[PDB]
Design an enzyme around this catalytic site. Structure first.
Site, mmCIF file in Angstrom:
data_model
loop_
_atom_site.group_PDB
_atom_site.id
_atom_site.type_symbol
_atom_site.label_atom_id
_atom_site.label_comp_id
_atom_site.label_asym_id
_atom_site.label_seq_id
_atom_site.Cartn_x
_atom_site.Cartn_y
_atom_site.Cartn_z
ATOM 1 N N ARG A 35 0.608 -1.212 0.050
ATOM 2 C CA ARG A 35 -0.109 -0.029 0.074
ATOM 3 C C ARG A 35 0.705 1.281 -0.096
ATOM 4 O O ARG A 35 0.285 2.344 -0.565
ATOM 5 C CB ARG A 35 -1.004 0.041 1.155
ATOM 6 C CG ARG A 35 -2.096 -0.987 0.951
ATOM 7 C CD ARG A 35 -3.199 -0.909 2.256
ATOM 8 N NE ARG A 35 -4.358 -1.570 1.890
ATOM 9 C CZ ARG A 35 -5.427 -1.618 2.806
ATOM 10 N NH1 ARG A 35 -5.114 -1.577 4.327
ATOM 11 N NH2 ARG A 35 -6.412 -2.485 2.696
ATOM 12 N N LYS A 212 -18.764 -17.236 5.636
ATOM 13 C CA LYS A 212 -20.145 -17.219 5.729
ATOM 14 C C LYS A 212 -20.725 -16.761 4.297
ATOM 15 O O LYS A 212 -20.247 -16.006 3.743
ATOM 16 C CB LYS A 212 -20.598 -16.188 6.860
ATOM 17 C CG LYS A 212 -20.267 -16.412 8.185
ATOM 18 C CD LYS A 212 -20.984 -15.412 9.280
ATOM 19 C CE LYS A 212 -20.180 -15.578 10.517
ATOM 20 N NZ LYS A 212 -20.644 -14.795 11.538
ATOM 21 N N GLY A 370 -7.395 -8.460 -0.187
ATOM 22 C CA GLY A 370 -7.714 -9.008 1.007
ATOM 23 C C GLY A 370 -6.966 -10.033 1.356
ATOM 24 O O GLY A 370 -5.580 -9.952 1.051
ATOM 25 N N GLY A 393 -11.879 -4.194 1.349
ATOM 26 C CA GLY A 393 -13.403 -3.751 1.639
ATOM 27 C C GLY A 393 -13.923 -2.785 0.652
ATOM 28 O O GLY A 393 -14.960 -2.921 0.041
#
Length: 413
Positions: A35, A212, A370, A393
């Site tokens: 980054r 999930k 991610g 995100g």
């Protein structure tokens, strides 16, 4: 439709730039400067185009509005950025106050200044927690003053913090300057997901992995309207296989609420001619632990009681290689197994090898910044794929069809 950095006349103008320097740390040491290097282009452009100075601001970790310089200071970032640019970087112990204002008021030409963690002030996020652990909300007046203070640090605003673009925080949407332009990283990131979602190459494959199913419903749904193939890996798979194949998943985590939407998910895939690929076999552990007893299982055999699937098996890997090879565009978001643990990292490792080869054959490969980005750095494939996003995100929101607050706040073309 936003003003771009390269279209601004920076001649002798102070530049206040928001970037995402929230890099993974360890003992005050940076374990991944991706980054940081990602922002270099915008910074260099500014200095090369006559900018009087470039003030940089970012957050680090989640200080929750409390000054924690002992473990959340950006000073280590200032040193790393200095070595990467071979140019001195003035690190300010804060991001607001008379001292900061004076230091940025009229710096010497070519000055690169890095402010301290913006989240040391509750005004950045608008809320946080006090010393006792109680959640508190920032005062409206203070928030306005905080934003007014940051705006005075530059004559022109540049937002290159793609990694935080989904956060409507003060430094991301409250800077009030006549020109608010996107940086080079911000636009490169946006353009990639744009073309993939509007004019995708075909076959178009989307690789989605996660624990999930519930939190990826909107993601999956939006993707099924454009892709030709989709691989679902990770923990989500057990929820689908159980509901669809009535597989015995043993102690594998189950998403009771996500399973309710599995039906309509499979219906949309069918209506759009999207072939969904689930694992056919897996690597099991007798507990959720890196040193768990290792076993195996297939859909037919099911998973023994007390055991859980933590990665796909050999036959699944072979199948994924087949689907990955017949694609011209790939959007990968989420590992296929517990990559952090060697015994259950084979599945994700193989997929990576296939994606790398897919790139070599002319396939466009976009990795979601991610866990998938972590894997690329882990196995050194960052330069072997088309694009490795710096924000998981943010990319998630875009791939869902949502807009990024950090983008909408910029000036239009």
């Amino acid at each position: 439709a936003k003003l771009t950095l390269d279209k601004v006349d920076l001649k002798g103008k102070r530049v206040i730039m928001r970037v995402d320097f929230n890099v993974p740390m360890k003992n005050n040491q940076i374990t991944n400067n991706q980054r940081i290097k990602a922002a270099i282009p915008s910074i260099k452009h500014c200095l090369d185009n006559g900018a009087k100075s470039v003030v940089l601001m970012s957050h680090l970790g989640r200080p929750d509005g409390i000054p924690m310089p002992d473990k959340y200071s950006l000073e280590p970032v200032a040193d790393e950025l200095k070595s990467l640019l071979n140019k001195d970087v003035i690190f300010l112990k804060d991001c607001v106050g008379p001292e900061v204002e004076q230091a940025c008021a009229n710096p010497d030409n070519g000055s690169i200044i890095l402010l301290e963690n913006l989240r040391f002030h509750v005004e950045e996020e608008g809320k946080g927690k006090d010393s006792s652990g109680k959640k508190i909300s920032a005062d409206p007046a203070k928030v306005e003053a905080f934003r007014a203070s940051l705006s005075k640090l530059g004559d022109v605003y540049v937002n290159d913090a793609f990694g935080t673009a989904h956060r409507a925080h003060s430094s991301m949407v409250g800077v009030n300057l006549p020109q608010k332009a996107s940086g080079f990283l911000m636009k490169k990131e946006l353009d990639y997901f744009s073309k993939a979602l509007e004019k995708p190459e075909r076959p178009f494959l989307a690789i989605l992995g996660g624990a999930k199913v519930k939190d990826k419903i909107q993601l999956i749904k939006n993707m099924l309207d454009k892709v030709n193939f989709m691989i679902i890996g990770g923990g989500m798979a057990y929820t689908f296989l159980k509901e669809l194949k009535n597989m015995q998943i043993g102690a594998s985590l189950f998403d009771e609420e996500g399973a309710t939407i599995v039906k309509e998910i499979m219906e949309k895939a069918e209506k759009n001619g999207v072939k969904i690929v689930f694992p056919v076999d897996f690597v099991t552990g007798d507990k959720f632990d890196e040193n768990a007893k290792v076993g195996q299982a297939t859909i037919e055999s099911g998973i023994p009681s007390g055991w859980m699937g933590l990665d796909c098996g050999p036959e699944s890997i072979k199948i994924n290689a087949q689907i990955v090879a017949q694609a011209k565009l790939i959007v990968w978001n989420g590992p296929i197994g517990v990559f952090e643990w060697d015994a259950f990292a084979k599945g994700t490792k193989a997929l990576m090898d296939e994606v790398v080869k897919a790139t070599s054959n002319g396939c466009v490969t976009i990795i979601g910044g991610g866990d998938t980005a972590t894997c690329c750095a882990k196995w050194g494939t960052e330069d072997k794929v088309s694009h490795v996003s710096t924000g998981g995100g943010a990319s998630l929101e875009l791939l869902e069809g949502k807009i990024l607050p950090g983008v909408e706040a910029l000036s239009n073309m």
